[PDB]
Design a binder for this molecule. Structure first.
Ligand SMILES: Cc1cc2nc3c(=O)[nH]c(=O)nc-3n(C[C@H](O)[C@H](O)[C@H](O)COP(=O)(O)O)c2cc1C
Ligand SMILES: Cc1cc2nc3c(=O)[nH]c(=O)nc-3n(C[C@H](O)[C@H](O)[C@H](O)COP(=O)(O)O)c2cc1C
Ligand SMILES: COC(=O)c1cccc(CCc2c(C(=O)O)[nH]c(=O)[nH]c2=O)c1
Ligand SMILES: COC(=O)c1cccc(CCc2c(C(=O)O)[nH]c(=O)[nH]c2=O)c1
Lengths: 313, 313
């Protein structure tokens, strides 16, 4: 018995991978993610030029999860493109490249260059619809006309199957609107739910201080705090986007949390805070634990229970 | 050393009270909250007509908090108005009456009727904006045009100081816009942050089932899941609404959580899930725990540390 699967025309040894931004910034990180037992890896979201990101401390974790305001530090698109084109060993596992340009034009410029490497090598694209705050305007994925623009422009410029990383939604009307926008675009083959829960605030009682330096302590939350929000979003998109795959991200620390994502409809399962805290060994534990739940229930395949969460009456 | 506060022209023995919807539906509930050591109580959010609410199970709790889709079950406005005018003992503690009409017209009708009792007895109004409007539109407080409408008409119909219960926000743009709307209305003297984190989904791994019946399992999240989100919202409004009070609500299980809310800027501190789970004995524990933290830090009153959370640099 094994957790092997095929999608987007690639084979994956198991449904696990890092979440974008975790253990994926440097050549050292990507090589370590490659050497792990993960099923796939995703590079850090990049911009055209390298960025240092925000002042430190800019990430902190706690028993129930993490807060970050990293500021999109990254080595620049040229570095991740070179990683995808010359350095990654595709015989080991698939690679996804996350892009997060600060304007539509910047995104269009990076995807035009990624297209022939995607054709030649099979690197897959994850378009990240989250960016640093611009006063007077909402996040792109919270502004449905801007979202529709980015997607129209990228699908035109890239011309190949790609995926989008979405922030969480909290209102049913927003699920219906966002999914309708995503469904206008046949090249969006996968949706990743969810990015960190925006602008939480952790305060330390002893020091009476916030715990990260940028943005007066405000930053995105991950880990145990966000599991039910992550499951709601995976399931909301699984139901509304029957012709796409959903990848689950948020709150995965155990094979049980992975099993819940898959029941909710997840095809791949990304690990962020728990990977940051435990290291790449977590992938062999997560495989063992999900296999163990499956055996106890009598499930031979992920397909037997994916998206089969039961409702009452 | 003391927990006493005077606000809104009332005196409160301590900052604790129930969160609306918890232990406040019936006369029996309200007399219980009155007999407890809470500094105040708020009645269940009511509609003009009595409501049975959604089918059960519609609330469930777990180690890290709760999920609910109650559907606004309540005994109807006439009951809560009668409780405020004839039954509540104001010599014990102040009363807030929460209203949550299904349309602006229903809100307006309630508050015209409330107004004479508010002037005579001193009951204080909390208008719930984290509430359904027209289906397929977002809840009122996530639609800034509907929000401005509700506040204009309620200000006019009521003519007295009131407060508003707000859903959590996740994007800085929303904090900016929401506070600017609120700051248009000088009768809005307090803002309660936050209502439940909307449409999460809790799944039970053993049964492979959702845990509440309404809305295919989707429901509002409370408790340990939402503390950082609640602290962010309290601090964001404390900073942006310098002429208003902020009441904090979300994730309070201990005097230490209360202490964080107050450093974030909370005046009153409300207790929902932990109160539902532990019962009204929680209020003596919370007061003890908060006084111990204060004693250890040398704080003699709440004003010494309210709003004084430190940032880094
Ligand atoms: C330090 C850190 C860096 C991150 N950077 C990115 C990023 O560059 N791109 C992105 O799409 N999401 C990024 N995220 C969000 C994660 O991909 C993930 O969506 C989030 O942490 C929720 O998952 P978790 O509960 O497993 O942490 C980052 C998260 C963390 C904690
Ligand atoms: C069973 C239940 C019923 C609730 N009903 C209401 C309500 O009627 N009006 C309201 O403004 N909020 C209501 N809420 C939200 C609580 O007031 C509170 O905002 C939310 O639970 C967050 O606080 P907590 O983390 O202490 O639970 C309810 C919450 C629960 C769990
Ligand atoms: C609401 O989004 C933001 O505030 C924001 C700020 C800086 C960078 C980004 C994009 C990269 C990113 C980051 C990051 O590099 O700070 N952290 C996350 O949790 N998710 C992300 O997608 C988003
Ligand atoms: C028809 O009214 C509703 O179905 C409904 C839905 C969501 C929220 C509300 C307002 C009451 C409320 C409830 C509730 O009664 O379901 N639960 C919460 O966690 N916060 C609330 O403010 C009503």
């Amino acid at each position: 018995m094994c957790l092997k699967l095929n999608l987007l025309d690639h084979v994956f040894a198991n449904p696990f991978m890092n979440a974008a931004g975790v253990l994926c910034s440097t050549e050292e990180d990507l090589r370590c993610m490659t050497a792990s037992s993960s099923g796939a890896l995703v590079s850090k979201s990049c911009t055209s030029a390298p960025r240092d990101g925000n002042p430190e401390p800019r990430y902190m974790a706690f028993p129930l999860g993490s807060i970050n305001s990293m500021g999109l530090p990254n080595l620049g698109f040229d570095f991740y493109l070179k990683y995808a084109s010359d350095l990654h060993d595709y015989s080991k596992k698939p690679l996804f490249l996350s892009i997060s340009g600060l304007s539509v034009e910047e995104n269009v410029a990076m995807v035009r260059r990624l297209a022939p490497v995607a054709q030649e090598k099979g690197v897959l694209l994850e378009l990240n619809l989250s960016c640093p705050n611009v006063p007077g305007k909402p996040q792109v994925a919270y502004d449905f006309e801007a979202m529709r623009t980015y997607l129209q422009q990228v699908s035109l410029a890239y011309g190949l199957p790609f995926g989008v990383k979405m922030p969480p939604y909290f209102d049913i009307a927003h699920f219906d609107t966002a999914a309708a926008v995503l469904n206008e675009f046949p090249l969006v083959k996968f949706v990743t739910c969810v990015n960190s829960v925006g602008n939480g605030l952790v305060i330390d009682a002893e020091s009476e201080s916030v715990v990260i330096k940028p943005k007066q302590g405000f930053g995105g939350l991950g880990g145990k705090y966000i599991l039910p929000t992550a499951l709601a979003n995976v399931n909301a998109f699984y139901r509304r986007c029957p012709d796409k795959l959903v990848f689950g991200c948020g709150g995965v620390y155990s094979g049980e949390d992975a099993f819940l994502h898959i029941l909710a409809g997840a095809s791949m399962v990304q690990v962020g805070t728990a990977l940051q805290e435990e290291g790449p060994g977590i992938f062999t534990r997560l495989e063992d634990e999900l296999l163990e739940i499956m055996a106890r229930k009598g499930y031979r395949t992920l397909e037997e229970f994916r998206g089969r969460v039961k409702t009452i009456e």
